[PDB]
Amino acid sequence: VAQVQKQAPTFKKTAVVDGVFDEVSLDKYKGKYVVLAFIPLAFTFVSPTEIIAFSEAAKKFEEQGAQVLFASTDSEYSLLAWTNIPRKEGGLGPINIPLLADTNHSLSRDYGVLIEEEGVALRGLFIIDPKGVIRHITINDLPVGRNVDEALRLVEAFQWTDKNGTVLPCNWTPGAATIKPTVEDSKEYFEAANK
Amino acid sequence: VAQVQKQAPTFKKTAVVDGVFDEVSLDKYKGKYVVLAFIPLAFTFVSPTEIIAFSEAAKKFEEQGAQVLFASTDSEYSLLAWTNIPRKEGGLGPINIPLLADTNHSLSRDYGVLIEEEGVALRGLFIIDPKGVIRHITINDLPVGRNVDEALRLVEAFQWTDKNGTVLPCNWTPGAATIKPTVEDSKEYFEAANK
Amino acid sequence: VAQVQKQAPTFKKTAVVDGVFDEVSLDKYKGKYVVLAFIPLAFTFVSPTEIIAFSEAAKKFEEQGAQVLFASTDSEYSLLAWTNIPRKEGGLGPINIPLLADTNHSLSRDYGVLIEEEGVALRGLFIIDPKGVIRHITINDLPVGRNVDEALRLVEAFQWTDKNGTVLPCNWTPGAATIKPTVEDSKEYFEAANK
Amino acid sequence: VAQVQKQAPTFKKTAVVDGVFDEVSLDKYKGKYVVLAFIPLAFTFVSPTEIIAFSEAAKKFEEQGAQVLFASTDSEYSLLAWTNIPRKEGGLGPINIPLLADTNHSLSRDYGVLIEEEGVALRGLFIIDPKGVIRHITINDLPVGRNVDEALRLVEAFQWTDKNGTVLPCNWTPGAATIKPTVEDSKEYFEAANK
Amino acid sequence: VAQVQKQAPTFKKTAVVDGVFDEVSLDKYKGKYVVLAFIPLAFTFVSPTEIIAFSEAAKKFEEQGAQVLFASTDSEYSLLAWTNIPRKEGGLGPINIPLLADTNHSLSRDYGVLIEEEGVALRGLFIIDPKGVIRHITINDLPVGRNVDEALRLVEAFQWTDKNGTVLPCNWTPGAATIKPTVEDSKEYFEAAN
Amino acid sequence: VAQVQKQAPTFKKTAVVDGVFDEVSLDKYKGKYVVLAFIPLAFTFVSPTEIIAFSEAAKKFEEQGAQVLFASTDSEYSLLAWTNIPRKEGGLGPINIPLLADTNHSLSRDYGVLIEEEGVALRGLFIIDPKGVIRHITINDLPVGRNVDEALRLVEAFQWTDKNGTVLPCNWTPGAATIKPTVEDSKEYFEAANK
Amino acid sequence: VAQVQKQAPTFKKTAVVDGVFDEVSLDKYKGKYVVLAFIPLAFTFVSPTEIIAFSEAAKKFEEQGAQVLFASTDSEYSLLAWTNIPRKEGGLGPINIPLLADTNHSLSRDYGVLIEEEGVALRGLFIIDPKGVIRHITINDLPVGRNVDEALRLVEAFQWTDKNGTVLPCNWTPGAATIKPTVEDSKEYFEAAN
Amino acid sequence: MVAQVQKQAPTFKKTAVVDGVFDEVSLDKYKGKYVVLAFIPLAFTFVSPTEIIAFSEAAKKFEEQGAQVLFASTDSEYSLLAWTNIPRKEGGLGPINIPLLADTNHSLSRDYGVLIEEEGVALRGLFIIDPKGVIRHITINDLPVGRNVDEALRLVEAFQWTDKNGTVLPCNWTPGAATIKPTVEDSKEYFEAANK
Amino acid sequence: HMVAQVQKQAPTFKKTAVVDGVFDEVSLDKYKGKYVVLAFIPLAFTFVSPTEIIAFSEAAKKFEEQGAQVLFASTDSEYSLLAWTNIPRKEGGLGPINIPLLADTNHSLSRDYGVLIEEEGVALRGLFIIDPKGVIRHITINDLPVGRNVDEALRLVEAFQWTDKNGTVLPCNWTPGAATIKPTVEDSKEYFEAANK
Amino acid sequence: VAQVQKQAPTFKKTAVVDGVFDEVSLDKYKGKYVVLAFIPLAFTFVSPTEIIAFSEAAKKFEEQGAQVLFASTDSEYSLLAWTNIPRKEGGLGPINIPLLADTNHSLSRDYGVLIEEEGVALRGLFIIDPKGVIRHITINDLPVGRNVDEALRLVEAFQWTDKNGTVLPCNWTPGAATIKPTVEDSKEYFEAANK
């Protein structure tokens, strides 16, 4: 499966990019950070809200050197169709993020988010670094959408730790106190953090 | 093998509770959500902040029907000793959440967060409901603290969905619009939200 | 796998039936012939032309003790969506036949029509008798549609055969000749057919 | 283990080609679509209507660059013997199409049409293209014969789609409306087909 | 598979009996020795001569309490069809002995005579006793037909030793010298034969 | 084991060959037909008669190009000392046939005539052509002896076919009607054979 | 296979006993020591001497409560035959010890004396308890007969052992000094033997 | 598996007491000689002393027949040595003329097939092994009965004869007694001569 | 398969032993209610082993007083052991001895206690302290050329006796009368505040 | 595992060496005898007393050419933290011996002193020679500390036998008598040791 600290399972999927079919793979986005977010089913409820909120935030992630991909078990024909139904009617409308079509279930299987019985993916989201390792997993059960901002926090967070060697405290958003993870230089932080 | 919508690997761990040793285990919190967050290692850096920020926020979880257990591969003795070290010097000082000693690693193993070669757990956090099913999994690679508000949010979220049978869109917080997951009742939300 | 002369893999699948979801299964059509027809993809090209044709034909299968089921690897949400598109735009309109979501592949797999690497069923068509026995299989490669009248013809051929224990020459259509299948009795037919 | 989209099983069988024995293999009809049609038994009842029917249509099939091959698990001599009986009395008389002796059941086994229990092949028909890919399988249970016209229709179909790259709607015969298999271009078909 | 002194593989087989499909087992001829004879295939060359020969001798085998049975892997239709062609034409004409269709090859396999790759039996003849036990086996390659008389001899030979409990010299025929199979009594035979 | 049209199992066996011991193998007669004949036991009853019969017949076999060989599980010494015993007393007297000691049971076992529970070979007789190929098997249960004539027939029988590529009818002796194994030329036989 | 201190592999083997056939079996001599002795071949050279030497001593074993059996992969027939040949020739003429026909090789196999490749029995000999327990094994390569006297000695030794529960020194024979097998009692022996 | 006649005797390298001194012993220490390898159950017991002492008395006689007697038990070299250091009057061995092979780790005994596993001692197994390293004779006596020096001797001389002369020994053959020309024809020379 | 391990039941045996100049069967059972100090030596008739056996035999009364039985075991037969016994110490003999000698002729003791050099068929200098519940509380394994320590074995017996009885926990180097620790975080501090000025 | 007179399982483990972390391995002390002593837990009771004891003895272990290494299953951070706690308060204070962190349990597992169920090591201590061979193992159950003077006793002892090929009686200390391990020479010792 996909595991934090391990290489992200490799894939080439047909995807709806800018309203046309184009193959996508981690390579397509060297060496951006990749946010691969699975939804269970096109034409449903929680899912569109997520696709939308990430799409609306597509640029915020580009700013962070991140490319967010959405993955579904539906076909590209189904994903596409969904972008052709406007958002007022639960459609996705126009979308700035790729909808990857995981019709053969390999993505959802490899990413350990396939509910075999149902043949759909859990609300798994995966943050993958330019070295293609998985730095974060979020998996949600079906009824509750993930957090666009958390997703972003984490892209930012991991990008920081990658650039600075510094380690990031719980809730750190960029600008908050970061730690130096030696026993010595980490006093800087704890001394400063606790009045 | 701790996986969303399966039953949380069950357990019984010696833990540090209000400063003394105590057996902890899912059913010790019969009826409540539990937020089980592993941290790599006591006496480190991100981990204190996690424990603290979650300890400081204990009441808030407790107000949402959630109990929060933290966990490491350290013995309860190490953990207890960390508790006896002031936060100004990277200890935890007094805290309000149980610190489970996963000294034999079952807990980390069973939760799929154990870094075998390191013998510590990734920053895994699992929101386990009353019927004991895992409902959310966050796994952050080592260098990035997780985020208390999101753990809380998710708790509230699953609590909402468990209760109202309604589903909760991306970025939901109390009072944000919810959706009735049926083709014809969900239209309410979509018209209303225009997305 | 699904096999002629052998019992048809039973299923219980969720289906768009008359614009709402419904579980269909073989036994739901007690005493009826079911013709089960798989399709590669919703929102594509020959598939709808097949669904439409068979849907339009339904009554002619009704009069023949048969019930048509289409199935595909698509979710019932897609299928349903599909249904809500005008045929002019590649949709199926309203539709007189159930569409089985086989969103976990079980049905395509069990019927031996699943294309592993793709996740879609070949154009498989199974005529299953009221005894649950697969009396005929048709499988087309993807780019070529099936033949309503021949599905129909075959059902008739089997209804006829089951009821009369005569055997049906190449190309029989109701009212065409017929061979009582014994060395002594077939002469009857072979002598009328030649000279 | 003969599946649509895969390499029809190779074989080399003694056959009756024009009153004499002769090896035949897929390969003897390089370039031709082959339609390999199994019957259960020589000397029976619907079996000889299928051979006879296809034998009249040989010229028609030849004209579509198809070679028609019939197979059963009778010995070459039994098939030849069958050829030497006038059709008036259950016979085949002279025929135009080869009759493959599958005396050892390797063909019938290999094509998934052999009733192990009975040593006779089901009424399987395989349309194999010049690439040796199986394009369509018809399997009929014993008591109903196939349709010569549909073997033609589908030869003509797969030939068409190979040459033209347009996919073929349900019931398509040559001259019928085709579809250009892309989202944007299939609208051509859908607008015209739904006046 | 079938070995001498072991139980004969039992079977139920559609067969052409009296020109009409009958179901045929060893049971069918309880108490009868049976001569089960496998031929490669219908509409060929040695084979008709064999079944014809046997058909001809049927009553001679009946007289020795033996049922003759033929089997090939050809279907019953094919076998029946074979009976419909005159013998001058390589057909069988009427025959007095049943024709087991081993279309699924079980018989031929079970009996150790199936050429797996050809789907056809070697020329295997088997003499099976009432108790069910294979007592003789002949397997002829395809190119050479068997020996009716020889099968008769053997049926007669065991039909004897079954009842007279004595023992049949090489080339024995009804009325030739037998051997009392003990060290004491055999000396009779050996002395008289030399 | 050993089977008709499979190679004969090779061997070197010590044997009595005109009184002295001799190492005897299949290739000791390269180009000749071999008639391996298995008797149960030395100093028994049927078994000497067979040997004695085949001994006087050795002349005939040499003529039709055959080496006749006899074998038992009995030792070189038991066999040798069986031939020191005059035929008047259950012995063999001097003989022309090699007597093959299969003390270790490998001949009998390899030839499928070893009755394991008893350590004795059944009345097995294999005819092997010069290409090392079992042409004929006769296996006789113990109480009845074989047929020197029939052994001879079957040698003359196979020598012919080997030589003339014609196939011998039931009961064929030399200069009896023979057969051209073709659907055409075989008719010259069936005509001459029936009226 | 067979091992000292372990139960003797049992058997039912047809034998030549007083010139006729009988079944022989360890418990047929219940209460007797059984010296079972294997010889590679009938109509060879060392085997008869061993058989004769042992037959001639049959009486001597009888007196020590031991039954002597011989065996071989030859049939009861080859044996019987070998029995009908003057020793002059030889042997074995008439003998007083059963000859066991290990025609199927089971005995030899079980007793570990069977030369698989030959397959005859090595000159194994086994002295067996009235309790069915192997107490002695000698095995000789094919070219050297055994030693009847030694066999007798051994039978007597273990008859004594069993009876008395003292232990027998090297070369012991009936009458020879014996050992009491405890640290303290054995002194009297060693002291006396030097 | 184990030692069998006609089959090559399992090699061994074992520390042993030779002339009251530790030395390594192996079959090919006596390259050329027949080796008579004899197992005993236990140092300091009752039958064993005798057997060892016996073969040790007659060690020269075995040397004289191209043979080196070996004794082996599962005792250590120190037990065996210590045994040679208790006078025979008291239940001891030594001094002795034969080597005593310490099978401390049981490999010799289990290889020769004579180890009572539950007991960790060897059965009175004695092996006759030719200069080609082949087992020619096996004797296994249960514990309570000692073996026969003379029989061991006899059998050694028997196999020296046939190794050399190609003839075969009858039952009871002692050097000087009648051999047999091992052939159906030259055989009868012996059978006739042996009989009335 | 699985050897003796501290905090597991010492593998049971029943072994012929030399007990007071005569042969006797010995098991853990024979010592119901006693700590057993089971100690293996490689070989009767050697150099370090007798020193250890004599050392421990001299000390048996001191072990008996601590509620311990000492056993020795080797891979030698009971006949060599007894025979070793019957030799004076003056010449590397064991002399009369107060602790049983266990004959592990068939090696199961050695095997089960995982102290058996298989290539060699002798046991290592393994000493096992077994409590009355039958639990191995201590293992010492010395390589062959160094002998062990009666005092230590005795000390350890006393340590475990102490522990079982008192529920306190024993510092490095503790002998009866030395400071103990009560094994709780708050109560341990008693011991730590005292042992450090 | 790790057995006497076999090679000590090798390791590379992080260790607290004088306040800072360091990689420790056997071959870091090429030449020295290694006393590798496992403890069960940092922050407990017997364990410090042993480390503290061996720490004070450090120099006399080096004087005998040995290096003492302590190891537990705690992290480098626990160990060090313990080093920061004054000995008065249950801590370890400044120390002279390395503290190996066996967080992945491999060392413990390898030396066979890991109580799996607990994830802590028994008080195993190993004396490993400059050749890497374990010469002595002591394993104490948890409730009872080890003897520092005995550890030294035994470095010395082997340091002695290694150097001198003499052999050391029970309770040997430096300067006590020594046995020459040969039947003849040992007589000296025994003669000198008994009346």
Side-chain angles (χ1 to χ4, degrees), chain B residues 75-87:
Chain B
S75 76
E76 75 270 19
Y77 293 94
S78 288
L79 291 172
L80 202 256
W82 197 18
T83 250
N84 270 303
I85 277 154
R87 309 185 176 165

PDB file of all heavy atoms in Angstrom, chain B residues 75-87:
ATOM      1  N   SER B  75       8.265   3.748  27.295  1.00  0.00           N
ATOM      2  CA  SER B  75       7.691   3.209  28.508  1.00  0.00           C
ATOM      3  C   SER B  75       6.986   4.309  29.266  1.00  0.00           C
ATOM      4  O   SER B  75       7.408   5.484  29.209  1.00  0.00           O
ATOM      5  CB  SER B  75       8.807   2.683  29.419  1.00  0.00           C
ATOM      6  OG  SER B  75       9.497   3.739  30.065  1.00  0.00           O
ATOM      7  N   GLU B  76       5.970   3.919  30.034  1.00  0.00           N
ATOM      8  CA  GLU B  76       5.257   4.858  30.858  1.00  0.00           C
ATOM      9  C   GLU B  76       6.193   5.567  31.839  1.00  0.00           C
ATOM     10  O   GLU B  76       5.853   6.628  32.381  1.00  0.00           O
ATOM     11  CB  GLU B  76       4.176   4.135  31.626  1.00  0.00           C
ATOM     12  CG  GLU B  76       4.679   3.312  32.773  1.00  0.00           C
ATOM     13  CD  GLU B  76       5.004   1.888  32.376  1.00  0.00           C
ATOM     14  OE1 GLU B  76       5.186   1.604  31.159  1.00  0.00           O
ATOM     15  OE2 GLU B  76       5.052   1.057  33.316  1.00  0.00           O
ATOM     16  N   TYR B  77       7.355   4.967  32.094  1.00  0.00           N
ATOM     17  CA  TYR B  77       8.301   5.609  32.962  1.00  0.00           C
ATOM     18  C   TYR B  77       8.870   6.799  32.212  1.00  0.00           C
ATOM     19  O   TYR B  77       8.966   7.874  32.792  1.00  0.00           O
ATOM     20  CB  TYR B  77       9.409   4.660  33.450  1.00  0.00           C
ATOM     21  CG  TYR B  77       8.866   3.597  34.348  1.00  0.00           C
ATOM     22  CD1 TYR B  77       8.491   2.348  33.837  1.00  0.00           C
ATOM     23  CD2 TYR B  77       8.692   3.835  35.713  1.00  0.00           C
ATOM     24  CE1 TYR B  77       7.952   1.357  34.669  1.00  0.00           C
ATOM     25  CE2 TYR B  77       8.158   2.867  36.537  1.00  0.00           C
ATOM     26  CZ  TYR B  77       7.795   1.640  36.005  1.00  0.00           C
ATOM     27  OH  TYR B  77       7.251   0.701  36.810  1.00  0.00           O
ATOM     28  N   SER B  78       9.235   6.647  30.942  1.00  0.00           N
ATOM     29  CA  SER B  78       9.809   7.791  30.229  1.00  0.00           C
ATOM     30  C   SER B  78       8.787   8.889  30.151  1.00  0.00           C
ATOM     31  O   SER B  78       9.085  10.078  30.354  1.00  0.00           O
ATOM     32  CB  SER B  78      10.182   7.414  28.810  1.00  0.00           C
ATOM     33  OG  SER B  78      11.316   6.587  28.892  1.00  0.00           O
ATOM     34  N   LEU B  79       7.576   8.451  29.843  1.00  0.00           N
ATOM     35  CA  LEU B  79       6.480   9.332  29.663  1.00  0.00           C
ATOM     36  C   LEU B  79       6.222  10.097  30.981  1.00  0.00           C
ATOM     37  O   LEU B  79       6.217  11.341  31.014  1.00  0.00           O
ATOM     38  CB  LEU B  79       5.285   8.531  29.134  1.00  0.00           C
ATOM     39  CG  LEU B  79       5.432   8.007  27.687  1.00  0.00           C
ATOM     40  CD1 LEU B  79       4.273   7.064  27.321  1.00  0.00           C
ATOM     41  CD2 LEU B  79       5.503   9.140  26.693  1.00  0.00           C
ATOM     42  N   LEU B  80       6.086   9.367  32.076  1.00  0.00           N
ATOM     43  CA  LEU B  80       5.882   9.998  33.372  1.00  0.00           C
ATOM     44  C   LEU B  80       6.947  11.058  33.620  1.00  0.00           C
ATOM     45  O   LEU B  80       6.637  12.147  34.073  1.00  0.00           O
ATOM     46  CB  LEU B  80       5.889   8.935  34.461  1.00  0.00           C
ATOM     47  CG  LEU B  80       5.260   9.096  35.851  1.00  0.00           C
ATOM     48  CD1 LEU B  80       6.364   9.315  36.832  1.00  0.00           C
ATOM     49  CD2 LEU B  80       4.173  10.159  35.931  1.00  0.00           C
ATOM     50  N   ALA B  81       8.181  10.759  33.246  1.00  0.00           N
ATOM     51  CA  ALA B  81       9.318  11.656  33.519  1.00  0.00           C
ATOM     52  C   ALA B  81       9.296  12.913  32.669  1.00  0.00           C
ATOM     53  O   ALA B  81       9.947  13.920  32.973  1.00  0.00           O
ATOM     54  CB  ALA B  81      10.661  10.918  33.343  1.00  0.00           C
ATOM     55  N   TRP B  82       8.560  12.828  31.582  1.00  0.00           N
ATOM     56  CA  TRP B  82       8.491  13.903  30.624  1.00  0.00           C
ATOM     57  C   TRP B  82       7.462  14.852  31.194  1.00  0.00           C
ATOM     58  O   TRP B  82       7.495  16.080  30.994  1.00  0.00           O
ATOM     59  CB  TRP B  82       7.987  13.326  29.307  1.00  0.00           C
ATOM     60  CG  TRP B  82       8.225  14.165  28.122  1.00  0.00           C
ATOM     61  CD1 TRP B  82       9.113  15.197  28.003  1.00  0.00           C
ATOM     62  CD2 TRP B  82       7.594  14.023  26.862  1.00  0.00           C
ATOM     63  NE1 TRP B  82       9.051  15.728  26.743  1.00  0.00           N
ATOM     64  CE2 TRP B  82       8.129  15.026  26.014  1.00  0.00           C
ATOM     65  CE3 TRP B  82       6.632  13.153  26.366  1.00  0.00           C
ATOM     66  CZ2 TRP B  82       7.742  15.179  24.687  1.00  0.00           C
ATOM     67  CZ3 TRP B  82       6.238  13.297  25.063  1.00  0.00           C
ATOM     68  CH2 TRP B  82       6.803  14.317  24.219  1.00  0.00           C
ATOM     69  N   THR B  83       6.540  14.242  31.920  1.00  0.00           N
ATOM     70  CA  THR B  83       5.470  14.935  32.545  1.00  0.00           C
ATOM     71  C   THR B  83       6.028  15.748  33.709  1.00  0.00           C
ATOM     72  O   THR B  83       5.469  16.797  34.082  1.00  0.00           O
ATOM     73  CB  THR B  83       4.457  13.905  32.959  1.00  0.00           C
ATOM     74  OG1 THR B  83       3.315  14.064  32.126  1.00  0.00           O
ATOM     75  CG2 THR B  83       4.047  14.037  34.411  1.00  0.00           C
ATOM     76  N   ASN B  84       7.148  15.290  34.254  1.00  0.00           N
ATOM     77  CA  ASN B  84       7.736  15.956  35.378  1.00  0.00           C
ATOM     78  C   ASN B  84       8.781  16.964  34.959  1.00  0.00           C
ATOM     79  O   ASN B  84       9.564  17.437  35.784  1.00  0.00           O
ATOM     80  CB  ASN B  84       8.307  14.929  36.358  1.00  0.00           C
ATOM     81  CG  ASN B  84       7.288  14.513  37.396  1.00  0.00           C
ATOM     82  OD1 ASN B  84       6.745  15.369  38.125  1.00  0.00           O
ATOM     83  ND2 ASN B  84       7.009  13.199  37.483  1.00  0.00           N
ATOM     84  N   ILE B  85       8.813  17.274  33.669  1.00  0.00           N
ATOM     85  CA  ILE B  85       9.736  18.272  33.128  1.00  0.00           C
ATOM     86  C   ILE B  85       8.964  19.450  32.567  1.00  0.00           C
ATOM     87  O   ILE B  85       8.119  19.278  31.665  1.00  0.00           O
ATOM     88  CB  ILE B  85      10.645  17.692  32.038  1.00  0.00           C
ATOM     89  CG1 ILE B  85      11.835  16.991  32.685  1.00  0.00           C
ATOM     90  CG2 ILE B  85      11.155  18.803  31.111  1.00  0.00           C
ATOM     91  CD1 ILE B  85      12.455  15.874  31.834  1.00  0.00           C
ATOM     92  N   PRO B  86       9.260  20.660  33.078  1.00  0.00           N
ATOM     93  CA  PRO B  86       8.469  21.839  32.660  1.00  0.00           C
ATOM     94  C   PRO B  86       8.531  22.102  31.144  1.00  0.00           C
ATOM     95  O   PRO B  86       9.528  21.805  30.466  1.00  0.00           O
ATOM     96  CB  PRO B  86       9.102  23.010  33.435  1.00  0.00           C
ATOM     97  CG  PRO B  86      10.159  22.401  34.332  1.00  0.00           C
ATOM     98  CD  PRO B  86      10.498  21.043  33.780  1.00  0.00           C
ATOM     99  N   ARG B  87       7.459  22.669  30.639  1.00  0.00           N
ATOM    100  CA  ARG B  87       7.347  22.914  29.235  1.00  0.00           C
ATOM    101  C   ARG B  87       8.386  23.903  28.751  1.00  0.00           C
ATOM    102  O   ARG B  87       8.797  23.845  27.605  1.00  0.00           O
ATOM    103  CB  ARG B  87       5.929  23.364  28.896  1.00  0.00           C
ATOM    104  CG  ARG B  87       4.848  22.439  29.452  1.00  0.00           C
ATOM    105  CD  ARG B  87       3.482  22.880  28.988  1.00  0.00           C
ATOM    106  NE  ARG B  87       2.410  21.986  29.397  1.00  0.00           N
ATOM    107  CZ  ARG B  87       1.122  22.318  29.358  1.00  0.00           C
ATOM    108  NH1 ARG B  87       0.773  23.537  28.930  1.00  0.00           N
ATOM    109  NH2 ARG B  87       0.173  21.455  29.748  1.00  0.00           N
TER     110      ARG B  87
END
